[PDB]
Nucleic acid binder design. Structure first.
Ligand SMILES: [Mg+2]
Ligand SMILES: [Mg+2]
Ligand SMILES: [Mg+2]
Length: 1258
DNA sequence: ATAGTTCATAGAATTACCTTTTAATCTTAAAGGACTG
DNA sequence: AGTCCTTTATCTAAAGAACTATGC
C-alpha cells in the first residue's frame, strides 16, 4: 500500500507567501493612533504613487530625447534585414550566427549610447531625489522656468510646485524606492528581456517595420492604385512630417512620401513614442473633430480596394502596428471624447439634452414631434415629390429592408435589376427609383409573398410615436435625477444602482434607435463638390434641423456609457511602514535595529512585534540578558544569503581584506575568475578559462575565512571534502543550506507588557481562523506551513525556511456593518442535500464581517524545500519512475462534455475501467454540491447583463473555486491508485478545462495530505512533487510531470471493444452514385443463423483516402431517430426486411444482395437503403442517451451501453474519457519501452491510435 | 407534408469601458558614506 | 566607537420557433 511516488519528495524548492491578519495586542492600537502612524502611511502611499509618477515623467523625457538622438548605421539595418529574410526559407547555422551578430551589434550600439549619457548616471541612485550636496529637482525647476506644465493631464498632482514638495517629502527615504529602481533598470537593461526599450526597438519593432516595408513594396507590385497617395499626403500630412531623412541625412523638416517613410534608414524615426505614434497613425488614420468622416490609413485603403476587386489575397498585406515604447504615456492623434466626472454630470447633462429636444421649434415653429409627423404624413400621402428625396445607399437602406421586409438585399436587388430592365454605385437613391423598382419587383414575383412601398411609408409614419414612448421614461428619469443630482457622489456605478442604470440606458437606447431610423435621410457633409443633387429644399430644411438637434445623442451616449461602465473605486489596502523604510527587509539578529520587526511565540500563538523607530535597541543583548524570563519566546534569526555574493563581499572588502589576508594566488584567481566557468571577472581584468585547481584553492580560502570570521563560525558548518567539489556552486549550496538557523530567547511577560504599554513596541498576534480556541477542524495548508517554520523536526534539517521582505498592510472598513441574521433565529440552510433544514446560533452572523471593520495584515514570504535546487529535467525523472513501476500505474483520463464540467475514467494497464464518475458533484458522506448548474447560471448572467451596463462580479473566482475542489479530488485519486493524469489536447468551457489543467499542475507542485503524519511521505515535511512549476499554456506541450496531453480525435463515436468508427458517411445524391457506392462493398449478405443483415467492406475502396481496414457491420439492435411529426425506436433489420420484400429481393435463403441491390433503378429504393445504412452506422442514440456498436466482437456480441459490464463505459461521456485514457495507455507503453539516453516520443497519430484501438481486443 | 434556412453577415479604422495572460525585479546581511561622540 | 541611511557582493544549467420549399 506504498505509493510509487514515494521517492518524489523534497525534489525542488519553491517560494510562497503566507497571509495573516495582525490583531493589535494591549495598548498597541491606542499608541498607534496616538502617533497617527496609520493615516501618515495612507498619506505616504498616495505621495509615493505621485513620486513614482514624477520620476516616470523624467524617464519618459529621457527616453524621448535619447532615442531621438540615436542613429543606427544604415549598413547595420541592411545587414540585419538581409540575414533576417534569408532566415525565412533557411535554418543554416551561419545564418543564425550572423543574425545574432547583427542584432547584437545594433543592441550594443544603442545600449552603449544610452549608458554614456549624463542623465543616466544619476537615474537610480540617491542623487535623483535626495542629493547629498538633484537632477529631478533640476529638471522640474527648468520646466517651471521654461513655463511648461508637465502635470496638466492628471488630477492628483496639481502643478510643478506640488511635485517639488512631494519629492522633497522623501528626503531620507531613498531606499524606500530601491525596488522601484530595479523595475526602472529593467527599462534600460542590456540583458535580453522584454521590459527593455532596447528589446522593444530591436526584437519587437524592427522586424515589424521590415515586414511592413516588404508588404508595402509587394503591395505596390500587386495593387498599385490600391492606396490614394495624394489623399493620405493631405489627411496625414501632420503625422508624415519628420525632422530628419536618415537616408540623406538632410535635417530639414517636411512631409515625407510613403516611399521615404519605408526607407530602411528612416526606421531611425520610429524609435521613440512620437515616431511610433506617427507611423501607427499612417497605418490607422485618425478622427478629426469637425470632420464628418474619418481620415483613412493604409490598412483602410488595402481593405477597401481588396473589397472593390473582390480579392482576399490583399489581406495578407495588411500592416502591423508598432508596439508602444516602454513607459510612454502619450496622447492619441485621434479625437478623444470629454469625460463626465460624477453622477451630477450624468443626470444634469441628460436632463439638459431631453429638455432641449422638448423645447426646440423649427422654422415653421412646430415641435420636432409635430414636424416629423407632418413630414412623414405628407410623405405617406404622396403630396411630396419622390424624385427629389433620397435614401443613403449605404447600410442604412439595408437596415430599412430588414426592418420592414425582413430581407436586407430586397431593395438593392430591386434597383439592381431595375437598371437591367457597368453601373457604378450611387451615394444616394431617390425615392422615385425605389418605388418603381420594388413595384416591378412585386410584379415579377409571386403576389402573396411581396413587399410594398406603403410599408416603408408606414414605417416612417409610425416613427413619431417613439417620442410619446420616451416621455414617461423621461419623467421617472427625472425622479432618478433627483436621486443622483449630488455633486461628488460617483456611486451611480455601484452594483446597487443596477436598476437605475438600466432605466437610464433604456431611455438613451430609445433615443439612439430613433436617431438611426432617421439617419437614412440625413445627408452627411463629406466634401465632394463634383455633383450636388437637386432635392426638395424645404423637406430637407426642416428635416435636417430636427436631425441636427437629435444627433447630439451620440456624444451624450458615449460620455454616459464611458462613465457608467467604469470599475468602482475602492480604497483597498495600503502599506504600513511604521516610520521605517526598511521595515521587514530582513529578520537577522544583527539587522533588528534597522528593520525593527521581531517574531514571538507565546503559548501556541505567534506574534509580530514592531519596535518604534525612536527606540530600536529595545531587544539588544543587554535587554534580553536582564529581561530573560518565561513570558514570550523571541525568535533569533541567522541567515547567510547569496553566498556567491556575500563571501567575496565580506572577505575581499576594503574593511577586512587585510584581516583575511588572501594570497596573491587567490587574488589572481579572483581577478580572472578562474574559479568559475561563466563567472564575472573583476573589472579591468580578462576572464580566464576555468581551472579546477584554482576553484578548489578558492574554496579552501573560503573555508579558512569562514572559520576566521567572528560571527559565521556559529553556524557550525559541516563541509564536504573540498576535493569532492567539481564547481564552486556545490560549495555555495552547502554554505547557503547550512547558513540558516532559528533559535529562541525567553523574554519575561512583564518586559513585553511594559514596552508595549510605553508605546515602544507594537505587538500583534499573527492570526487566521485556525488559531481560534473554537477551531477543532483540519487547518489550512498555510497554517501547517507557517507552524512548520518553527517546528523542531523542521529545524533539525530545514525544509521550511522564513524569508525576509515581509510586508504589512492596513485595510479600511469597506462595507457598512449590517447584521444579516439575528442570533437565536433559525436560518434556512442553503444546501438542499442537507439533512438539517435550518440552523440556529447563539450568536450573530454578519455578511462579509471582515470588511465591516478596519484590519491589519501580514504577508510573509517563505521558501519550501529550502535545501533543494530548482526543478531540472523533471519529466525525465517521472518517466524513469513510471518505466520502472509501469506494472502498477493506472490512467486517470479526464474529458469535458456538455453534460459535465469534468468527467473521469480510472483505467488499469489492461484497459479495464476501475472507476468512472463525474466531477460535477463534490461532498462528504453527509452533504453534496453540484457545480454544473451554478456554472451554467454564471455563463447566462454574463451575456445577459452585459447589455444592461450592469457590473459582472467574480465569475472567474466562482469557477476557480469549484476547480479548487476538483484538484483535491484528483490528487486523492492519483495517490491512491498510482495514476498518471491524461487530458485532451487544446471557448469559455474550454477555458475552464485549461484552468483545471493549470491549477492541477500547481497543486501537484507541492502536495500535502492533512491526515498524513508530519514526518511521513505526503505529510508537511515530505510533500509529493509530481509536476514542475507552471510556465505557460503553450509550454505545457505533451507532458507536465505525471500529466500528459493527447489529441482528442475520434474519442467520441467509436466502439469500446472493436474500436470501430464510422468513416463512410453515406449520403444519397443520385441513383448512379448509389449503385456505384453499394457496388464497392465486398459482400452484402443475410445471416440466417444470426437473424440480421451484414455489410462487409474495406475502407480503402471508398472515396476518402484516409480510411483503412476491413469491417462487417450488422443491422442488429435498436436505433433511435428524432423527427418533426418526437423520437421513435427503429429496428433497421426489420426495416430492411420490409424494403427487400417490397422490391422482391429474396434474402430468405441467406443469398448475397449486392448485385440485386445494385440492379434497382428506383430513387426511393436507394434513398431508403442509404437511410437504413445511416441509422445503422449511428452509434450515439439520444432520447429527446446511450451508445451502441454495429460491429460484433469475437463472441458475436454487439456493445450496448445500456447493459454493459462494470469495466466498460456505461454511457457516451465515459466513452470519451475512456478513449482519452486509451491514448494514455499508448503513452504508458511508449514510456515502458523507452531506453536510456533516447528521447521519448509523445505524439500520437491517428494511424497509431486506430491500429492500437482496433487490435487490442482483436 | 416536408425539408432546409434564418433570426443579416463580415472586413478595415478610431475612441471608451471592462477583462485576461505573460514577463521582468525582489523576497539580504553587511560593507560604505557620512557624521557624531 | 556608534549610528543612520544607502549601496554592494555577483555560481550553477542543461435551440427553437418561424419562414421557405415542395426535394414528400
Ligand atoms: Mg533617431
Ligand atoms: Mg479547517
Ligand atoms: Mg461566500
Amino acid at each position: 500500500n506504498a505509493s510509487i511516488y514515494q521517492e518524489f519528495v523534497n525534489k525542488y524548492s519553491l517560494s510562497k507567501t503566507l497571509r495573516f491578519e495582525l490583531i493589535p495586542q494591549g495598548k498597541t492600537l491606542e499608541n498607534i493612533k496616538a502617533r497617527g502612524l496609520i493615516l501618515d502611511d495612507e498619506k505616504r502611499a498616495k505621495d509615493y504613487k505621485k513620486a513614482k509618477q514624477i520620476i516616470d515623467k523624467y524617464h519618459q523625457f529621457f527616453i524621448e530625447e535619447i532615442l531621438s538622438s540615436v542613429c543606427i548605421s544604415e549598413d547595420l539595418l541592411q545587414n540585419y534585414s538581409d540575414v533576417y529574410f534569408k532566415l525565412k526559407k533557411s535554418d543554416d547555422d551561419n545564418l543564425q550566427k550572423d543574425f545574432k551578430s547583427a542584432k547584437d551589434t545594433i543592441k550594443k550600439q544603442i545600449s552603449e549610447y544610452i549608458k554614456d549619457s549624463e542623465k543616466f548616471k544619476n537615474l537610480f541612485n540617491q542623487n535623483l531625489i535626495d542629493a547629498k550636496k538633484s537632477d529631478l529637482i533640476l529638471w522640474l525647476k527648468q520646466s517651471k522656468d521654461n513655463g511648461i506644465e508637465l502635470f496638466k493631464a492628471n488630477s492628483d498632482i496639481t502643478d510643478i510646485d506640488e511635485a517639488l514638495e512631494i519629492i522633497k517629502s522623501f528626503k531620507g527615504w531613498t531606499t524606500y524606492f530601491k525596488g522601484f529602481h530595479e523595475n526602472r533598470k529593467n527599462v534600460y537593461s542590456s540583458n535580453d528581456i522584454p521590459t527593455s526599450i532596447i528589446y522593444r526597438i530591436v526584437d519587437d519593432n524592427l522586424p515589424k517595420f521590415l515586414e511592413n516595408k516588404a508588404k508595402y513594396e509587394s503591395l505596390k507590385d500587386k495593387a498599385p492604385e490600391a492606396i490614394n497617395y495624394e489623399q493620405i499626403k493631405k489627411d496625414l500630412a501632420e503625422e508624415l512630417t519628420f525632422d530628419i531623412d536618415y537616408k540623406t541625412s538632410e535635417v530639414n523638416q517636411r512631409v515625407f512620401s510613403l516611399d521615404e517613410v519605408f526607407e530602411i534608414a528612416n526606421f531611425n524615426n520610429y524609435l521613440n513614442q512620437s515616431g511610433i505614434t506617427k507611423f501607427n497613425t499612417i497605418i490607422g488614420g485618425k478622427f478629426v473633430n469637425g470632420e464628418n468622416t474619418k481620415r483613412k490609413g493604409i490598412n483602410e485603403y488595402i481593405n477597401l480596394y481588396s473589397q472593390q476587386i473582390n480579392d482576399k489575397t490583399l489581406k495578407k498585406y495588411k500592416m502591423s502596428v508598432l508596439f508602444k515604447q516602454i513607459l510612454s504615456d502619450t496622447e492619441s492623434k485621434s479625437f478623444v471624447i470629454d469625460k463626465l466626472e460624477d453622477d451630477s454630470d450624468v443626470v444634469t447633462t441628460m436632463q439638459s439634452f431631453y429638455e432641449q429636444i422638448a423645447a426646440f421649434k423649427t422654422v415653421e415653429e412646430k415641435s420636432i414631434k409635430e414636424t416629423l409627423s407632418l413630414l412623414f404624413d405628407d410623405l405617406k400621402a404622396q403630396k411630396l415629390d419622390l424624385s427629389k428625396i433620397y435614401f443613403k445607399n449605404d447600410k442604412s437602406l439595408t437596415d430599412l429592408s430588414q426592418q420592414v421586409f425582413d430581407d436586407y438585399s430586397v431593395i438593392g436587388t430591386a434597383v439592381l435589376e431595375y437598371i437591367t430592365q457597368k453601373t457604378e454605385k450611387a451615394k444616394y437613391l431617390s425615392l422615385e427609383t425605389i418605388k418603381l423598382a420594388l413595384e416591378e419587383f412585386n410584379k415579377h414575383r409571386d403576389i402573396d409573398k411581396q413587399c410594398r412601398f406603403e410599408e416603408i411609408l408606414a414605417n416612417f409614419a409610425a416613427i413619431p410615436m417613439i417620442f410619446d414612448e420616451i416621455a414617461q421614461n423621461k419623467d421617472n428619469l427625472a425622479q432618478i435625477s433627483i436621486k443622483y443630482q449630488n455633486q461628488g457622489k460617483k456611486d451611480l456605478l455601484q452594483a446597487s444602482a443596477e436598476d437605475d442604470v438600466k432605466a437610464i440606458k433604456d431611455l438613451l437606447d430609445q433615443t439612439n434607435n430613433l436617431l438611426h431610423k432617421l439617419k437614412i435621410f440625413h445627408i452627411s457633409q463629406s466634401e465632394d463638390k463634383a455633383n450636388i443633387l437637386d432635392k426638395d429644399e424645404h423637406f430637407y430644411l426642416v428635416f435636417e434641423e430636427c436631425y441636427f438637434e437629435l444627433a447630439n445623442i451620440v456624444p451624450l451616449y458615449n460620455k454616459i456609457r464611458n462613465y457608467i461602465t467604469q470599475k468602482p473605486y475602492s480604497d483597498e489596502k495600503f502599506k504600513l511602514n511604521f516610520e521605517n523604510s526598511t521595515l521587514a527587509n530582513g529578520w537577522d539578529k544583527n539587522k533588528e535595529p534597522d528593520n525593527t520587526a521581531i517574531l514571538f511565540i507565546k503559548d501556541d500563538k505567534y506574534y509580530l512585534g514592531v519596535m518604534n523607530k525612536k527606540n530600536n535597541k529595545i531587544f539588544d543583548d543587554k535587554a534580553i540578558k536582564e529581561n530573560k524570563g518565561e513570558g514570550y519566546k523571541k525568535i533569533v534569526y541567522k541567515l547567510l544569503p547569496g553566498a556567491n555574493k556575500m563571501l567575496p563581499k565580506v572577505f575581499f572588502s576594503a574593511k577586512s581584506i587585510k584581516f583575511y589576508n588572501p594570497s596573491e594566488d587567490i587574488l589572481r584567481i579572483r581577478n580572472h575568475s578562474t574559479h568559475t566557468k561563466n563567472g564575472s571577472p573583476q573589472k579591468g581584468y580578462e576572464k580566464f578559462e576555468f581551472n579546477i585547481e584554482d576553484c578548489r584553492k578558492f574554496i579552501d580560502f573560503y573555508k579558512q575565512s569562514i572559520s576566521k570570521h567572528p560571527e559565521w563560525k556559529d553556524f557550525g558548518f559541516r563541509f564536504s571534502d573540498t576535493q569532492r567539489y567539481n564547481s564552486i556552486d556545490e560549495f555555495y549550496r552547502e554554505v547557503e543550506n547550512q547558513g540558516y538557523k532559528l533559535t529562541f530567547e525567553n523574554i519575561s511577560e512583564s518586559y513585553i507588557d511594559s514596552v508595549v504599554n510605553q508605546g515602544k513596541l507594537y505587538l500583534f498576534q499573527i492570526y487566521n481562523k485556525d488559531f481560534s480556541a473554537y477551531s477543532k477542524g483540519r487547518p489550512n495548508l498555510h497554517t501547517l506551513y507557517w507552524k512548520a517554520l518553527f517546528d523542531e523536526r523542521n529545524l533539525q534539517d530545514v525544509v521550511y525556511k522564513l524569508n525576509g521582505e515581509a510586508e504589512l498592510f492596513y485595510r479600511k472598513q469597506s462595507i457598512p456593518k449590517k447584521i444579516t441574521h439575528p442570533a437565536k433565529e433559525a436560518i434556512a440552510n442553503k444546501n438542499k442535500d442537507n439533512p438539517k433544514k435550518e440552523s440556529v446560533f447563539e450568536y450573530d452572523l454578519i455578511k462579509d464581517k471582515r470588511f465591516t471593520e478596519d484590519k491589519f495584515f501580514f504577508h510573509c514570504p517563505i521558501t519550501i524545500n529550502f535545501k533543494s535546487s530548482g526543478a531540472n529535467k523533471f519529466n525525465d525523472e517521472i518517466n524513469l519512475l513510471l518505466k520502472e513501476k509501469a506494472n502498477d500505474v493506472h490512467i486517470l483520463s479526464i474529458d469535458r462534455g456538455e453534460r459535465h464540467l469534468a468527467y473521469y475514467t480510472l483505467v488499469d494497464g489492461k484497459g479495464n475501467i476501475i472507476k468512472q464518475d463525474t466531477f460535477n458533484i463534490i461532498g462528504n458522506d453527509r452533504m453534496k454540491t453540484n457545480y454544473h448548474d451554478k456554472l451554467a447560471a454564471i455563463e447566462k448572467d454574463r451575456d445577459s447583463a452585459r447589455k444592461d451596463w450592469k457590473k459582472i462580479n467574480n465569475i472567474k473566482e466562482m469557477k476557480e473555486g469549484y476547480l479548487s475542489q476538483v484538484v483535491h479530488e484528483i490528487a486523492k485519486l492519483v495517490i491512491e491508485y498510482n495514476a498518471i493524469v491524461v487530458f485532451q489536447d487544446l471557448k469559455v468551457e474550454k477555458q475552464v478545462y485549461q484552468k483545471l489543467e493549470k491549477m492541477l499542475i500547481e497543486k501537484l507542485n507541492y502536495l500535502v495530505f492533512k491526515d498524513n503524519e508530519f514526518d511521513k511521505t505526503g505529510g508537511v515535511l515530505r510533500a509529493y512533487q509530481l509536476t514542475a512549476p507552471f510556465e505557460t499554456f503553450k509550454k505545457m506541450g505533451k507532458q507536465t510531470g505525471i500529466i500528459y496531453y493527447v489529441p482528442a480525435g475520434f474519442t467520441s463515436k467509436i466502439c469500446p471493444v472493436t474500436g470501430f468508427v464510422n468513416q463512410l458517411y453515406p449520403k444519397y445524391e443520385s441513383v448512379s452514385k448509389s449503385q456505384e457506392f453499394f457496388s464497392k462493398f465486398d459482400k452484402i449478405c443475410y445471416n440466417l443463423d444470426k437473424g440480421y443483415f451484414e455489410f462487409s467492406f474495406d475502407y480503402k475502396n471508398f472515396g476518402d483516402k484516409a480510411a483503412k481496414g476491413k469491417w462487417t457491420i450488422a443491422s442488429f439492435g435498436s436505433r433511435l431517430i428524432n423527427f418533426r411529426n418526437d423520437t421513435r425506436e427503429v429496428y433497421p433489420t426489420k426495416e430492411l426486411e420490409k424494403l427487400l420484400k417490397d422490391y422482391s429481393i429474396e434474402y430468405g435463403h441467406g443469398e448475397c444482395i449486392k448485385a440485386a441491390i445494385c440492379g434497382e433503378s428506383d430513387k426511393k429504393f436507394f434513398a431508403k437503403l442509404t437511410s437504413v445504412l445511416n441509422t445503422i452506422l449511428q452509434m450515439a442514440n439520444s432520447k429527446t442517451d446511450y451508445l451502441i456498436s454495429p460491429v460484433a466482437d469475437v463472441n458475436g456480441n454487439f456493445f450496448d451501453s445500456r447493459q454493459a459490464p462494470k469495466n466498460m463505459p456505461q454511457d457516451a461521456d465515459a466513452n470519451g474519457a475512456y478513449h482519452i485514457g486509451l491514448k494514455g495507455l499508448m503513452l504508458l507503453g511508449r514510456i515502458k519501452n523507452n531506453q536510456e539516453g533516447k528521447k521519448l516520443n509523445l505524439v500520437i497519430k491517428n494511424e497509431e491510435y486506430f491500429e492500437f484501438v482496433q487490435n487490442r481486443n482483436n
